[PDB]
Amino acid sequence: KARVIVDKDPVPTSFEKWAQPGHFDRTLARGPKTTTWIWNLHALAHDFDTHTSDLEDISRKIFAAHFGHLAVVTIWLSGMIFHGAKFSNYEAWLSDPLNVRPSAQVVWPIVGQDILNGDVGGGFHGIQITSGLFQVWRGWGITNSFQLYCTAIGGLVLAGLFLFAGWFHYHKRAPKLEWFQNVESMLNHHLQVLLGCGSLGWAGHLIHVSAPINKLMDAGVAVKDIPLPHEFILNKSLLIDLFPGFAAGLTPFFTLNWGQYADFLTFKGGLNPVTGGLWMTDIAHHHLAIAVVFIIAGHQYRTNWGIGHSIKEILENHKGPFTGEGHKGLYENLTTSWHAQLATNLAFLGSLTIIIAHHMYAMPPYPYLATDYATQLCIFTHHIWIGGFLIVGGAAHAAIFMVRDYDPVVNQNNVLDRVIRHRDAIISHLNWVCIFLGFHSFGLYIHNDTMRALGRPQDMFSDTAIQLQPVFAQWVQNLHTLAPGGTAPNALEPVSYAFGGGVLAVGGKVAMMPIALGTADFLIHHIHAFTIHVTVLILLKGVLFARSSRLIPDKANLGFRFPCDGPGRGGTCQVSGWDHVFLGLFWMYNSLSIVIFHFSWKMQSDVWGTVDAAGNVSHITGGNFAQSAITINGWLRDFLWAQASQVINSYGSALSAYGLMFLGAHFVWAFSLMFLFSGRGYWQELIESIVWAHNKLKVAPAIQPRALSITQGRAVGVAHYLLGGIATTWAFFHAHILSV
Amino acid sequence: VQRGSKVRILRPESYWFQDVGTVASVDQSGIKYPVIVRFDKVNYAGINTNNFAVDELIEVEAP
Amino acid sequence: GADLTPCAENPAFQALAKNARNTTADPQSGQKRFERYSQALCGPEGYPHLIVDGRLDRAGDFLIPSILFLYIAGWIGWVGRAYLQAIKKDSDTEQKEIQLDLGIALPIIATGFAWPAAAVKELLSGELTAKDSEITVSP
Amino acid sequence: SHTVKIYDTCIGCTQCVRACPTDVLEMVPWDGCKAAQVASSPRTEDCVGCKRCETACPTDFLSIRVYLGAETTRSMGLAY
Amino acid sequence: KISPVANTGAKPPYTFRTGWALLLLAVNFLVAAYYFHII
Amino acid sequence: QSSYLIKFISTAPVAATIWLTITAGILIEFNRFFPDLLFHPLP
Amino acid sequence: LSGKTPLFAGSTGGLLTKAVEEEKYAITWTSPKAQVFELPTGGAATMHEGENLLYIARKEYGIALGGQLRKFKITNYKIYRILPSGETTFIHPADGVFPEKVNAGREKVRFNARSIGENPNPSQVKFSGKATYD
Numbered sequence A: 001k002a003r004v005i006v007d008k009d010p011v012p013t014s015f016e017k018w019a020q021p022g023h024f025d026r027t028l029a030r031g032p033k034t035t036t037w038i039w040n041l042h043a044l045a046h047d048f049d050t051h052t053s054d055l056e057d058i059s060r061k062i063f064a065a066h067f068g069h070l071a072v073v074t075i076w077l078s079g080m081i082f083h084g085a086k087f088s089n090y091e092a093w094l095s096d097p098l099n100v101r102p103s104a105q106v107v108w109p110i111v112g113q114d115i116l117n118g119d120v121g122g123g124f125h126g127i128q129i130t131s132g133l134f135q136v137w138r139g140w141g142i143t144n145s146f147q148l149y150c151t152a153i154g155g156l157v158l159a160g161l162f163l164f165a166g167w168f169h170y171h172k173r174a175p176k177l178e179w180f181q182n183v184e185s186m187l188n189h190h191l192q193v194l195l196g197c198g199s200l201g202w203a204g205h206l207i208h209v210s211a212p213i214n215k216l217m218d219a220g221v222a223v224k225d226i227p228l229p230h231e232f233i234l235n236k237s238l239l240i241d242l243f244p245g246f247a248a249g250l251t252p253f254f255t256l257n258w259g260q261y262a263d264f265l266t267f268k269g270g271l272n273p274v275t276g277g278l279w280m281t282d283i284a285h286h287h288l289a290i291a292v293v294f295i296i297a298g299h300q301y302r303t304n305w306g307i308g309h310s311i312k313e314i315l316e317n318h319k320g321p322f323t324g325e326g327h328k329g330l331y332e333n334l335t336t337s338w339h340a341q342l343a344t345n346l347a348f349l350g351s352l353t354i355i356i357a358h359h360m361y362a363m364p365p366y367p368y369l370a371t372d373y374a375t376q377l378c379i380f381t382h383h384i385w386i387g388g389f390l391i392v393g394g395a396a397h398a399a400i401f402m403v404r405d406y407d408p409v410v411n412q413n414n415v416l417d418r419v420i421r422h423r424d425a426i427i428s429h430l431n432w433v434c435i436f437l438g439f440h441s442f443g444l445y446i447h448n449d450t451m452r453a454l455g456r457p458q459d460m461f462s463d464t465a466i467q468l469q470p471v472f473a474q475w476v477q478n479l480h481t482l483a484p485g486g487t488a489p490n491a492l493e494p495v496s497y498a499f500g501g502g503v504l505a506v507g508g509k510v511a512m513m514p515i516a517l518g519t520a521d522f523l524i525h526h527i528h529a530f531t532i533h534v535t536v537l538i539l540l541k542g543v544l545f546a547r548s549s550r551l552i553p554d555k556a557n558l559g560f561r562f563p564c565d566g567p568g569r570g571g572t573c574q575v576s577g578w579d580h581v582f583l584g585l586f587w588m589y590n591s592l593s594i595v596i597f598h599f600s601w602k603m604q605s606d607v608w609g610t611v612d613a614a615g616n617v618s619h620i621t622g623g624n625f626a627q628s629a630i631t632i633n634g635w636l637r638d639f640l641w642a643q644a645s646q647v648i649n650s651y652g653s654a655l656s657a658y659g660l661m662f663l664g665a666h667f668v669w670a671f672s673l674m675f676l677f678s679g680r681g682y683w684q685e686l687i688e689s690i691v692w693a694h695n696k697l698k699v700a701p702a703i704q705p706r707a708l709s710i711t712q713g714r715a716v717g718v719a720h721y722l723l724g725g726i727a728t729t730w731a732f733f734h735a736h737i738l739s740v
Numbered sequence B: 001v002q003r004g005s006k007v008r009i010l011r012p013e014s015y016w017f018q019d020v021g022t023v024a025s026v027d028q029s030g031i032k033y034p035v036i037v038r039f040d041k042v043n044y045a046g047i048n049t050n051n052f053a054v055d056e057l058i059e060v061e062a063p
Numbered sequence C: 001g002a003d004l005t006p007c008a009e010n011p012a013f014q015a016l017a018k019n020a021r022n023t024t025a026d027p028q029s030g031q032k033r034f035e036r037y038s039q040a041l042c043g044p045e046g047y048p049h050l051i052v053d054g055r056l057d058r059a060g061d062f063l064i065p066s067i068l069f070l071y072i073a074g075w076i077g078w079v080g081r082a083y084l085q086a087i088k089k090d091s092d093t094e095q096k097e098i099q100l101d102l103g104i105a106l107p108i109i110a111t112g113f114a115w116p117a118a119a120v121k122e123l124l125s126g127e128l129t130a131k132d133s134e135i136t137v138s139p
Numbered sequence D: 001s002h003t004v005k006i007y008d009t010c011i012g013c014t015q016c017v018r019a020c021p022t023d024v025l026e027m028v029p030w031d032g033c034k035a036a037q038v039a040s041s042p043r044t045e046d047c048v049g050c051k052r053c054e055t056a057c058p059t060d061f062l063s064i065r066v067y068l069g070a071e072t073t074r075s076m077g078l079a080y
Numbered sequence E: 001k002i003s004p005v006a007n008t009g010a011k012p013p014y015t016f017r018t019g020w021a022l023l024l025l026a027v028n029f030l031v032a033a034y035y036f037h038i039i
Numbered sequence F: 001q002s003s004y005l006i007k008f009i010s011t012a013p014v015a016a017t018i019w020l021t022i023t024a025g026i027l028i029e030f031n032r033f034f035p036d037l038l039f040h041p042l043p
Numbered sequence G: 001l002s003g004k005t006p007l008f009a010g011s012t013g014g015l016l017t018k019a020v021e022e023e024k025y026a027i028t029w030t031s032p033k034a035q036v037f038e039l040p041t042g043g044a045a046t047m048h049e050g051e052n053l054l055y056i057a058r059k060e061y062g063i064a065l066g067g068q069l070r071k072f073k074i075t076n077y078k079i080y081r082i083l084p085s086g087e088t089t090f091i092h093p094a095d096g097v098f099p100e101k102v103n104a105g106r107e108k109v110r111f112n113a114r115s116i117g118e119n120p121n122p123s124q125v126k127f128s129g130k131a132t133y134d
């Protein structure tokens, strides 16, 4: 029964509540007797569930809060392209994308910081960029600055509309709870319009604008000689010369004579030799196929015409012998709790973001991205990290659903109740797996690290010694190299040259080549499996044991965020679902940090490097990965100690900021250790003595000062531990790759 | 001490020890620690009040 | 003086002065920098060295900066001490700490230029220090 | 095992007994003219020592303390 | 309450404190005198 | 009302941001005209 | 000891080897209705209309359950301690009155007539075999 239900003018728009803080909560609204009130104000600002219990009030805040968030992203995205318009070398970069490095940031001639605007290239003095926005605009067919200047103003205009929306909705026209609960209507709309039509539209831009323009640009024509996009639409003579399939018109589409469009809807599946990047026609045929699949898929659900599926009926009818009632009650949990929806969306979105990073490096989808190793490395590293954070957030809100929104009446002998009733077996076996892998993933390094020191290189786990080869992956590789012909016959070249095939060379660089898998990759892939399993153990344990444990029978009453539940029973320290998330983040950081290290050294040693006319590929680090990555000292020597030479020696040059942020990052990491190792008890007694000196000199504060709370001290530490950690490798990855 | 009088506690192990506090009520009974007081500064638990004996108190100012 | 020479005549200093790397937008910022630094004392490496002995021959190093700081810093403490005391007489003390009463604060910020006089006045006879017997203490 | 000692600053709020997970504390009648109720700790053997009694006490400093000592199966919270 | 946490029993001038401290200060200036070549 | 807006500006962050930006701009602007200032040159 | 078991499929979270060897516990309660209640160690279970009985590994599981029972307006919950030899002892409402409410028959235990500040120092009591909290 889809319907638009709205409440008119629930909440006014006065500036009164701005002045008095803590309006959202009653405890904070009383007054700030203590400095912990300040920290609690921020920690409870987005805890709408604590402010009120009416789901209408919660959902209205959430739906409007999203709009204010989009304005921030649009202002950001519009801000990036604006810098490309005014302060940049993009117009000059198109003339020579292989000799001019991309820059869009300029720092003013104030104290000593004009050095950062070095000779990046093209007569422009600016900071070199690694986000890859230059390659995106070329994929968008943007060839002049005024074109970019127009798009930036459009984003700022779009920002006000989103901003106007959240005001209009929370204050003037607030939807009721029924408007959000019609799930079946929501999913049809997003799949078909937001994803389907949005994909179908982008196919139009690629076919009409990007593919023709880029087909002229790689040919060798000057940038000024390229016609504008509207010129292609009006004058069809120019379009037919490149893609003669358009001469037939739209009649082959309706008559199902779709082969006439083969020129610009190809299935080559390889990279463009001229510009390192996938073919625009292949990308053009991409979104058209995606849109039809999405448009069709979204009609599955009923949305108030009797035709379609009810998700409740799908889930309930998937019972089985082993699972008692199957998926019964999950629809009720997901329709009565925002945290459950947030946990599912975060977890799979994070895994998606990691899945993007692996596709992009092997299948570079933009022109000249592969030759820019700096953009390629930071791009992979970026999304790899963002996906790791979002996955951990999924476990947190998964546990928050348990303490706050779990209904035992609904979850009775269902798939979830049955999972909690054997949680001991889930963790005890996952405990066994984590120990098994940590021994047989890291112990093999120690055996190699120990043997090479003893002068016994024959007894190692190396390619000449006992080698454990990854036969399973090498088998899967050959199937992809042979997909040209046989299975997937119409494809001319494989989906990626990473699986195998011939080498591709752009200028003097190499875009991609076969990534051979040896003993080193067999070990590192297990190291990843080891580190991934442990954070799952930490996070999954918090979800199941948040309600109760053998130690604590009533853990839900204390809440999701409680420090200890006392010092007895031995010690109940960090027993909450919150503290599991706190611990899992360190392991998320540990696991994710080896992935990018596996990426950096392998791609530099095996893949990237200058290429000669005869095909001789002079790799960057000289193929040292196979015989050095098997030992821990090899990474310390060949990866960290050696490649960090550019960072420390960056002083007196344009990359000096990276050497500073690199060194400064170690500080914040160590500053984290104040809060993790210490405890609130010592610090409150220190403040006591300091308060005496103020009471002496009559500088005593009315707001009585107290040390930080326990969970805050843990939160403050992990924030520093990760910020100081990530910023370190951030500068090392940047300064090293930018020099080479 | 009479009600409504500012008073300086002398009990050690008290958060407000050697600090002034008003007298909100007094109990005419044989109970130990009969006097009830109230302070502007809250303790670590946020209670702001506690009962104390007569000998643990000085009359700083008149009621 | 220890293991150093005058900055004007040191060769290593003149060697760096030719390539000064002007900081600001002004082209001559580099040459103007090394010109003023000729007054100071320099070492073998070519960089200048400051002497915080307290001798009046070299007082711009630390002594003049020292006086300029303490006048500025005492302004901040005297202002904060006075603003905090004035609030305590009012009824709602905690809210005024967060939501500043600018009507009370800006008159105090207008003062503070004569903080040393008020400091001596409170020290000689006043409220610069509270008694030890009337302050909270642990057992 | 863990000794729970009560002092004369009790006022009969009973908030300690309600917080006890294991039902160690029990209110008892104060024969004097203070109140009709003052706390006690008869079943001290089941004191796990989670200090919930202390967090619930409204005094300046505690009317009831929990001095830790020897450990047992009942105190360590072991279900095995 | 067995022992007070604040001690008492002294006069404004503090002759004994000033006498020994001024001696320690007098030595500090004597060392500074040799450094500045006053002596 | 304007009385409510003034209270918002007088709060801790906005009062701190307005003040620190002013003190920052002074040091920032003074340093572009008077570049280096390692010490006070004494005549 | 009599009653009916709450109807649930079972759970790993529950009774272990300690029950056979030493001091398993039990809890009994009676409800007019038959609702769904969360068990002390994971899971959910229904409850019969008369004389429900559950075996628990510790005393903390029962009072934690009893607090949940009070949400359903059930105030008659009795906890036992079953030894390996079959000896059962009625514990939690040791008298008919609950602990939070006062009963005349009870006596004060481990009460110190002094305040905490009045306790002796450790140096005053060393090698005597007595503690400061006495």
Ligand code: CLA
Binding pocket: A011, A012, A013, A014, A015, A016, A017, A018, A019, A023, A024, A060, A061, A062, A064, A065, A067, A068, A069, A072, A163, A164, A165, A166, A167, A170
């Ligand atoms: C047009 C002006 C206007 C006015 C006068 C109000 C007034 C009000 N709104 Mg409202 N609102 C507006 C626009 C406005 N809103 C818009 C445009 C949106 C859509 C985003 C909303 C969405 C909204 C929601 C969802 C809620 C309110 C609420 C409120 C009330 C309390 C707000 C408060 O005291 O917090 C004042 C808080 C601030 C001034 C801080 C806001 C910070 C902004 C939004 C984000 C800044 C991001 C920034 C880039 C981060 C940088 C970080 C780094 C650099 C440090 C109050 C009546 C709340 C309410 O009614 O409570 C029951 C509530 O739940 N409003």
Ligand code: CLA
Binding pocket: A042, A043, A044, A045, A046, A047, A346, A389, A390, A391, A392, A393, A394, A396, A400, A561, A578, A581, A719, A723
């Ligand atoms: C879609 C993303 C998303 C959303 C909407 C939420 C939303 C929420 N989370 Mg959540 N979370 C997420 C992702 C998300 N989270 C991820 C990825 C993690 C893993 C790190 C967590 C971990 C997490 C925990 C552990 C907790 C929450 C909690 C909450 C709730 C209250 C938070 C609050 O008061 O905000 C205000 C939050 C703050 C003021 C903290 C500020 C943290 C700053 C931004 C860190 C600094 C990072 C910055 C980039 C550093 C550089 C700049 C700096 C140097 C200037 C709220 C419902 C809390 C809760 O009680 O839920 C019921 C809670 O306990 N979340």
Ligand code: CLA
Binding pocket: A431, A434, A435, A436, A437, A438, A439, A442, A443, A446, A534, A537, A538, A583, A586, A587
């Ligand atoms: C380098 C430091 C370090 C090491 C080695 C470990 C090791 C471990 N942590 Mg961990 N941890 C650390 C730092 C570390 N942690 C930090 C800083 C934190 C805070 C965030 C945590 C937080 C944390 C949590 C939250 C969890 C772990 C878990 C684990 C275990 C995973 C199982 C495993 O790998 O098998 C054991 C593997 C090893 C011990 C690796 C080295 C073993 C070598 C190869 C063998 C030794 C040779 C020989 C036998 C020596 C004999 C000598 C003889 C003379 C006696 C393991 C014991 C998880 C766990 O226990 O799940 C099972 C878990 O849940 N840790």
Ligand code: CLA
Binding pocket: A660, A661, A663, A664, A665, A666, A667, A668, A670
């Ligand atoms: C107060 C005491 C103190 C101090 C000052 C230091 C100082 C240091 N420790 Mg340290 N440490 C201490 C106590 C201390 N330690 C104790 C007690 C322990 C426990 C044993 C440790 C454990 C420890 C470890 C484990 C590590 C250190 C490291 C370091 C170094 C940090 C590197 C760095 O940033 O260079 C200083 C350089 C800069 C700050 C310049 C670069 C940054 C620019 C200026 C950034 C911009 C800053 C800007 C002004 C403000 C940011 C604002 C912005 C957010 C808006 C430095 C020498 C780390 C290190 O580097 O060692 C190799 C390290 O790994 N220490």
Ligand SMILES: CC1=C(/C=C/C(C)=C\C=C/C(C)=C\C=C\C=C(C)\C=C\C=C(C)\C=C\C2=C(C)CCCC2(C)C)C(C)(C)CCC1
Binding pocket: A697, C052, C053, C054, C073, C074, C077, C078, C081, C119
């Ligand atoms: C000459 C010289 C020198 C020396 C110096 C010295 C050695 C000094 C010291 C000094 C001292 C040894 C002093 C002490 C003092 C003490 C005190 C005691 C302090 C404080 C005071 C007060 C009490 C304060 C108060 C206040 C005010 C006044 C204002 C602001 C606020 C406040 C409140 C903080 C040198 C070599 C460096 C250099 C060259 C020259």
Ligand SMILES: CC1=C(C/C=C(\C)CCC[C@H](C)CCC[C@H](C)CCCC(C)C)C(=O)c2ccccc2C1=O
Binding pocket: A674, A675, A676, A678, A679, A680, A681, A683, A706, A707, A708, A709, A710, A712, A713, A714, F016
């Ligand atoms: C250091 C530390 C503290 C003490 C840390 C404190 C008190 C942080 C204080 C942060 C700032 C400095 C508070 C004051 C900020 C000022 C009000 C800002 C002044 C205004 C100008 C800056 C404009 C804990 O409380 C703690 C608790 C649990 C585990 C570990 C620790 C721990 O390690």
Ligand code: SF4
Binding pocket: D009, D010, D011, D012, D013, D014, D015, D016, D017, D039, D056, D057, D058, D059, D063, D064
């Ligand atoms: S003072 Fe503490 S122990 Fe005594 S009755 Fe109140 S809460 Fe219970």
